[PDB]
């Protein structure tokens, strides 16, 4: 018994083998899921990465800003999994924000063109993915997205914080639409994980006073967490996501599950 | 196969076969857990009820107000599950509030003696259960308790609402202590279920409209006669599959709390 | 003694005399504030409306989407209030969302161009107003914006709900920047008010079912809620403009008759 | 001129001149309120303290655990302010917790007798004060109580944290009852202030590996606060309470106002 025996799950957002999306996929496969992967921009490079997953799985190009890709997605998936099958799961593990909206760059200096692009990719896309894919989702199934607790402002995360606050609201509306199909929609609010986006968008959003000032702030998780937090281990987050994909949280929708070692429950 | 293969889990709070505790136990057993049950006052009557669970399991008396029962509990459990074993799970599904602190009885008329008793049984006991049982819990294991969303005031629930607000805080402190043992502590905030205590809150058709301030709001709906979804949600926290969630609250309420209408 | 004796406060967002902005301004003036008003697009029509306030006050064009207006705003205000003076208060009472992102139009059908425009006007603008104006704000002063509780999803409000969730986050970051100047930044989360924009959420054909949902305020509110009376909201905003909430920033104050504290 | 011209306001919880209650009273009087003070146990000593307020004001004995004092309070107040008058305001600035429920003493080791006492005094009393006083309150008036943000667990505050979580719920119920009279009920959630209860119940709830560990946690306010926090200045808190007593927050009940320099809105 896999936790996800014979479930068909789409997984977006793999780019390196540190990606949260990757570990979600590895764990979903270990628990008997047959996957359909999506990737953005660097398909050849993503394909080397996905070969390292425990099982082969079809790979589809999806740039959540591409009108045509979303219009096509529903059909490209049906053709990848077998005509007359549907998905039981969907994982949105996608984010972006320009350099201007992040790190040491003044919050007031981010121009709206740039903020808008981030909100498009990191928040609105959760709705446009749900729109494209609900028609090919079974009753019982689960949409899951990735969140970083935005309830309080923090240094550096800046306009991404705002995108996550938007995503949180988007998720509650998707839950309403998804409800008509017997589908749940939830976010996992993870603690920090060494992934590409952490480094090149955030660590590289500061340079010098930079990446050791990542470090201290992120022990505003390991310290607070009553069971601790390990930034190098995505397994706990991946498992938490699989739990939402499974049949074992069947009464939770529009909601947020914290995979953060409990840190958000503790002030110190 | 089972979500909880070979896990040893204590389950408090069974009294009838409608009890949320009962369905937790049934589902935990269906997923391969070996249980140890706790019950209060009416042990003879509880035992007829537990015979209807899929498997037999030892039953132990625990009145969370009884000094001696808590002091003894740790050892009475070790003897029930095998000397040299420990628990992997603990479920607190316990509540009480005098009639004065609930229903049509004015909120201002509940005397503190009565409120205090409710807080003792419904909130503090979560801490005293955790104290008694953490020394016999394995790393990885989960403590779970039952909550009803107290963030907003509502008619009838009155001083139980206040007990739940207290319980929510108690849970976050237990998580700190439980953390030293590698143990998670969480609450499930369930939607309404027809149980004995629900009867004990108070005509009972005015309950009904307020409780469709769940089925209505819930994007996937809510069925007050079906505890399965709640029981499954609890088992999820008992399992290895939410390993980075502690001090926290999980809403098994059909999503109702995320919707204003 | 006015609550706001000799305070200089900018007030955006007036368009009719039902506008929440209007009642904020009336109450600020009743309490001794000298105002500087902003309006968008229909300046001639806004000016008839502002003449009905207890005192006349200069009116400046501000379209929060206009690069040049924001760059210029700081100086156009300094010239309106006296060179070598500054503002003590700023009120953002601005919102917009295309028809597609709202009412009976499916949530999944709003194209991002349209959502983005709403977020620009309703959320980002709070930051760009703060950017333009903090250099000419005194220590002690208050920035205030208008919110509608987005914590929970609801029918109709749709993508405006998402804009408010964004605004709530934006406000906490503005508070950080405003802090360097000795300035507070807060939002008032008001209950519903019969204003122009409220009619703009459907029209009609759905818009009587607004009413039941809005008694998910008057019913819940332990002191009730009157959709025709903006006074309580205007006063709540003035409280934040005053010296009497000096240790509250990045935050949200509910002027909703207590409705958000009650499930029923 | 005064923010509270000719308002009649009861103020509980004065014991030293560092008491938050004291500064509430001083500020209420500076803004034209006529007060009625309550005090507990050490009435002679409280009376030296209240003589230092800008105006004299009658002092009444109130031990919120005393059946008879609450039953009598309503009438003892009517007699202090004039027959045929009523109160426009009530300030609950009261708390207590045994040593066992606090500081270095293990959370698990507090016996319920002791926790119960704390909950009685710190939370339930808000309801029993409201019960005693609403019959002699005018429409428009305000009940206000003092809170310390209990939404996340923290070191030391222990079972007082639980009392405040209870108080927050109690306040929402009081608001419903108070609503029938046209009365608001709110809490102010203050940042830390050097008061007696801080020191002898909390700083002295540790002694040796002790009251300097309070210190780090309390700069989990001045640091986070975008406009900073001064533990020696109760004025900002007292003013915030007066704001709720005034006519200027007339649409806010059942609620919580953070007078904490914004710290609770900031993760770092
Ligand atoms: N790493 C953390 O600490 C952390 C914690 C919580 C939440 N998150 C969130 O987790 C998610 C995944 O990020 P990650 O840290 O695993 O990093 P990452 O860089 O591994 O993954 C981000 C992904 O977004 C993709 N992407 C960007 N623009 C896209 C577009 N137009 N179309 C489709 N995909 C696009 C990238 O190709 C990449 O695969 C994001 O939503 C992020 O906000 C990250
Ligand atoms: N049914 C609902 O709608 C609902 C909703 C949310 C939460 N809950 C919670 O679920 C838990 C159980 O409620 P239920 O509805 O399943 O109830 P129930 O009435 O079927 O069972 C309640 C139990 O309370 C226990 N109990 C009371 N005082 C005790 C004491 N001193 N020591 C030990 N046991 C004692 C009994 O063993 C009894 O089985 C409670 O914490 C309650 O708040 C119930
Ligand atoms: N009315 C309510 O029930 C209610 C409740 C909560 C919050 N609010 C908020 O109050 C604020 C004002 O709304 P209202 O209900 O008084 O309505 P309204 O229609 O009276 O005012 C909206 C204002 O926004 C201005 N505006 C729109 N686009 C602009 C732009 N590009 N640049 C500058 N100004 C622009 C308009 O010119 C108008 O002055 C909004 O932020 C709204 O969300 C209203
Ligand atoms: N000091 C802080 O930093 C801080 C911050 C936020 C909230 N609080 C809360 O503010 C309130 C006031 O505390 P403070 O710091 O002014 O302290 P304090 O020691 O100055 O005042 C506490 C008061 O408790 C009263 N009290 C104790 N037992 C009582 C009883 N049985 N009946 C009546 N009164 C009783 C005493 O008379 C005393 O005046 C409390 O509710 C406290 O929890 C304290
Ligand atoms: O959303 C994320 C959260 C985190 C956790 N995090 C935040 C921070 C900043 C210093 C506060 N550091 N780590 C890491 C990467 C994240 O991924 C992204 C961030 C911005 C844009 C795109 C992505 Cl995928
Ligand atoms: O904690 C519960 C919550 C609910 C939910 N609920 C509340 C209500 C009334 C309308 C407020 N109806 N259902 C039912 C039973 C519950 O169990 C108890 C309630 C009071 C006292 C003891 C218990 Cl076990
Ligand atoms: O932000 C508002 C909230 C409200 C309250 N509200 C909610 C609703 C529908 C029931 C959900 N109607 N009114 C009215 C006008 C509001 O102002 C706007 C709404 C949408 C777009 C632009 C503005 Cl300014
Ligand atoms: O409730 C309080 C909160 C605060 C704020 N605080 C708590 C703490 C220590 C970190 C836990 N430091 N400041 C100070 C005094 C407080 O007053 C009491 C504490 C326990 C019992 C009675 C009172 Cl008045």
Per-position DSSP letters for B1-68, written without gaps between them: --TTTTEEEEE---SSTTSHHHHHHHHHHHTTEEEEEEE-S-HHHHHHHHHTSSS---EEE--TT-HH
Coil vs helix vs strand at C60: strand
Indicate which of D192, D213, D268 best probes the interface with A, i.e. most A CBs within 10 Å of its own CB. D268
- Closest Cα to atom 23 of ligand 2: B13
Q: Select from B33, B25, B32, B35 the least CA-distant residue to B1.
A: B32
Q: Write out chain A residues lying below 8 Å of B233, CB-based.
A: 248-252
Measured in angstroms, the CA of D170 and the nearest CA of chain B are apart by 6
Cβ atoms of D265 and A153 within 8 Å: the answer is: yes
Q: Does residue C205 sit in helix, strand or coil?
A: coil
CB of A17 closer than 8 Å to CB of A26: no
Token pair, residue A59, equals 């790979």
The per-residue b/e assignment along B79-108, b for 16 or more CB within 10 angstroms, e otherwise, is ebbeeeebbbbbbbbbbbbbebbbbebebe
Query: Do B91 and B144 contact (CB within 8 A), yes or no?
Result: yes
Q: Extract the tokens encoding C71.
A: 């760059």
- Nearest residue to C30 via CA among C12, C8, C3, C51: C3
Nearest Cβ partner of C251 from D3, D229, D262? D262
Instruction: Tell me whether D169 touches chain B (CB under 8 Å).
Output: yes
Q: For ligand 6, atom 15, name the residue with the nearest CA.
A: B198
Please, which residues bridge with residue B20 across strands? none
Mark yes or no for CB contact D166/B168 under 8 Å.
Answer: no
Partner residues linked to D34 by β-bridges: D8
The CA distance from A154 to B152, in Å, is 28
Nearest C-alpha of chain C: how many angstroms from B153? 5
Question: Of C63, C143, C173, which to mutate for an interface test with A (greatest number of A Cβ within 10 Å)?
Answer: C173
Q: Is A267 on the interface with D (CB under 8 A)?
A: yes
Q: Where do breaks (C to N over 2.5 Å) occur in chain C, by preceding residue number?
A: 203
Gap between the Cα atoms of B50 and B26, Å rounded: 9
Query: Which chains have 3+ CB pairs within 8 A of C?
Result: A, B, D
Q: Which of C209, C216, C263 to mutate to test the interface with B (most CBs of B within 10 A)?
A: C263
Element (H, E) at A137: strand A137-147
Count the neighbouring beta carbons within 10 Å of the beta carbon of residue D193.
Answer: 22
Q: B37 vs A198, B26, B92, C196, C205, CA distance in Å? A: 46, 11, 11, 61, 57
- Tell whether ligand 1 has an atom less than 6 A from the beta carbon of residue A64: yes
User: A235: which 2 tokens?
Assistant: 């397994």
The pair phi, psi for residue B129, each rounded to 5°, is: -65, -45
Of A89, A116, A79, the residue nearest A101 (C-alpha): A116
C-beta A71 within 6 A of ligand 1: no
> Nearest-CA neighbor of D146 among D78, D80, D85, D193?
D193
Kindly report the protein residue whose alpha carbon is nearest to atom 15 of ligand 7: C198
Rounded-to-integer distance, Cα D95 and Cα D123, Å: 8
Q: Are the CB atoms for D203 and D244 separated by under 8 Å?
A: no
- Closest residue, chain B, to D128 (C-alpha): B108
Does any ligand 4 atom lie closer than 6 A to the CB of residue D121? yes
D197 lines ligand 8 (CB under 6 A): yes
| Residue A133 Cα distances to A56, A125, B59, D20, angstroms | 22, 12, 49, 57
CB contact (8 A) between residue C154 and residue B210: no
**Could you tell me how many residues make up chain D?**
268
* Nearest ligand 2 atom, CA B194: 1
DSSP β-bridge partners for residue D153: A266
Closest residue in D to A155 (Cα–Cα) = D268
Determine whether the interchain pair D220/A267 forms a contact, defined as Cβ–Cβ distance below 8 Å.
Answer: yes
Q: Which ligand is nearest to the CA of C92?
A: 3
A20 known ligand binder: yes
Q: Are C133 and C10 in contact (CB under 8 A)?
A: yes
Give the three-state DSSP class for C84: coil
Catalogue the E-assigned strands of B148-236.
184-190
Distance in angstroms (rounded) separating the CA atoms of residues D13 and D24 = 10
Q: d(Cα D11, Cα D28) in Å, to the nearest integer?
A: 10
Beta bridge mates, C153 = B259
**Which chain D residue has its CA at the smallest distance from C2's CA?**
D1
d(CA D255, CA D176): 11
CATH code of the domain containing D32: 3.40.50.720
Overall domain count for chain C: 1
Distance D149 CA to ligand 4 centre (A): 15
> Per the annotation, does B225 bind a ligand?
no
Helix (H, G, I), strand (E, B) or coil at A266: strand
Runs of H (alpha helix) within chain C? 20-30, 43-51, 67-81, 112-119, 125-133, 158-179, 196-199, 209-218, 231-241
A184 touches chain B (CB under 8 A): yes
CB C160 near ligand 7, within 6 Å: yes
* Cβ atoms of D149 and D107 closer than 8 Å: no
Q: With CA atoms as reference, report the closest residue to D93 among D40, D158, D141.
A: D40
Q: How far is CA C221 from CA A246, B154, B210, D178, in A?
A: 39, 11, 16, 12
Calculate how close chain C gets to A42, using CA atoms only, in Å.
24
Interval between CA C96 and ligand 3 midpoint (Å): 7
List the structure tokens of A88: 């039981």
- Residues in chain B with CB shorter than 8 Å from the CB of C154 are 259-261
Judge: A120–C112 Cβ closer than 8 Å, yes or no: yes
**Which residues of chain D make contact with B131, given a CB cutoff of 8 A?**
108
C93 DSSP assignment: -
Q: Which domain range does residue D52 map to?
A: 1-268
Structure tokens belonging to residue A167: 């995503």
Instruction: Please tell me the distance between residue D197's alpha carbon and the centre of ligand 8 in angstroms.
Output: 6
Q: Are B108 and D127 in contact (CB under 8 A)?
A: yes
Out of B116, B162, B176, the one facing D170 most closely (by C-beta) is B162
The reply to whether A119 sits in an annotated binding site is no
Q: What are phi and psi of B12, to 5 degrees?
A: -90, 165
Cα–Cα distance for residue pair D234/C92, rounded to 1 Å:
30
Contact A261, A226 (CB under 8 A): yes
Is the Cβ atom of D141 under 6 angstroms away from ligand 8? no
Cβ of D229 within 8 Å of Cβ of C246? The answer is: no
Cα separation of B259 and B213, whole Å?
10
Instruction: Identify the sign of the CA torsion D70, D75, D81, D86.
Output: positive
A175 chain-C contacts, CB cut-off 8 A: 153
Residue A137 contacts residue A86 (beta carbons within 8 Å)? yes
Q: Which residues in chain C are contacts of B152 at CB distance < 8 A?
A: 260-263
From chain D, the residues in CB contact with C245 under 8 A are: 239-240, 243, 257, 259
Which value in Å is the resolution of this experimental model?
A: 2.6
| DSSP, residue by residue, A171-211 | HHHHHHHHHTTT-EEEEEEEPP---HIIIIIIGGGTTTTTT
Name the DSSP class of B121: I
Structure tokens at D166: 């209870």
Q: For B258, name the nearest residue in chain A, comparing CA atoms only.
A: A254
Say if B206 is an interface residue toward chain C (CB within 8 Å).
no
Is the CB of D249 less than 8 angstroms away from the CB of C239? yes
Q: Half-sphere exposure of residue C2, counting CA atoms within 13 Å on the CB side?
A: 16
β-strand partners of B186: B144, B248
D150 and chain B in contact, CB less than 8 A: yes
Q: Which chain D residues are closer than 8 Å to A267 by Cβ?
A: 149, 152-154, 217, 220
Phi, psi of B33 (to 5 degrees): -85, 145
Helix/strand/coil for B227:
coil
Please state the φ and ψ torsions of residue A79, each to the nearest 5 degrees: -70, -30
Nearest-angstrom CA–CA distance, C251 and A2: 46
Q: Binding site residues of C, as ranges? A: 19-20, 63-64, 94-95, 157, 164, 193
């Amino acid at each position: 018994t896999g936790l996800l025996d014979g479930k068909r799950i789409l997984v977006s957002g793999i780019i390196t083998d540190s990606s949260i999306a990757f570990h979600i996929a590895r764990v979903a496969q270990e628990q008997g899921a047959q996957l359909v992967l999506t990737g953005f921009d660097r398909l050849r490079l993503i394909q080397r990465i996905t070969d390292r997953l425990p099982a082969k799985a079809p790979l589809l190009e999806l740039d959540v800003q591409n009108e045509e890709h979303l219009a096509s997605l529903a059909g490209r998936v049906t053709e990848a999994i077998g005509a007359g099958n549907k998905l039981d799961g969907v994982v949105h593990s996608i984010g972006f924000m320009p350099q201007t909206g992040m790190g040491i760059n003044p919050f007031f200096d981010a121009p709206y063109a740039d903020v808008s692009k981030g909100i498009h990719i990191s928040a609105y896309s959760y709705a446009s993915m749900a729109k494209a894919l609900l028609p090919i989702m079974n009753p019982g199934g689960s949409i899951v997205g990735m969140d970083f607790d935005p309830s309080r402002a923090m240094p550096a995360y800046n306009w991404m914080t705002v995108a996550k606050s938007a995503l949180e609201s988007v998720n509650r509306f998707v839950a309403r639409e998804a409800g008509k199909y017997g589908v749940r929609s939830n976010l996992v609010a993870a603690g920090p994980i060494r992934t590409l986006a952490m480094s090149a968008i955030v660590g590289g959003a500061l340079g010098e006073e930079a990446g050791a000032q990542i470090q201290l702030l992120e022990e505003g998780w390991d310290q607070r967490a009553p069971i601790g937090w390990n930034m190098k281990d995505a397994t706990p987050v991946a498992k938490t996501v699989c739990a939402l994909l499974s049949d074992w949280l069947p009464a939770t929708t529009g909601d947020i599950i914290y995979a953060d070692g409990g840190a958000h429950t503790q002030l110190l």
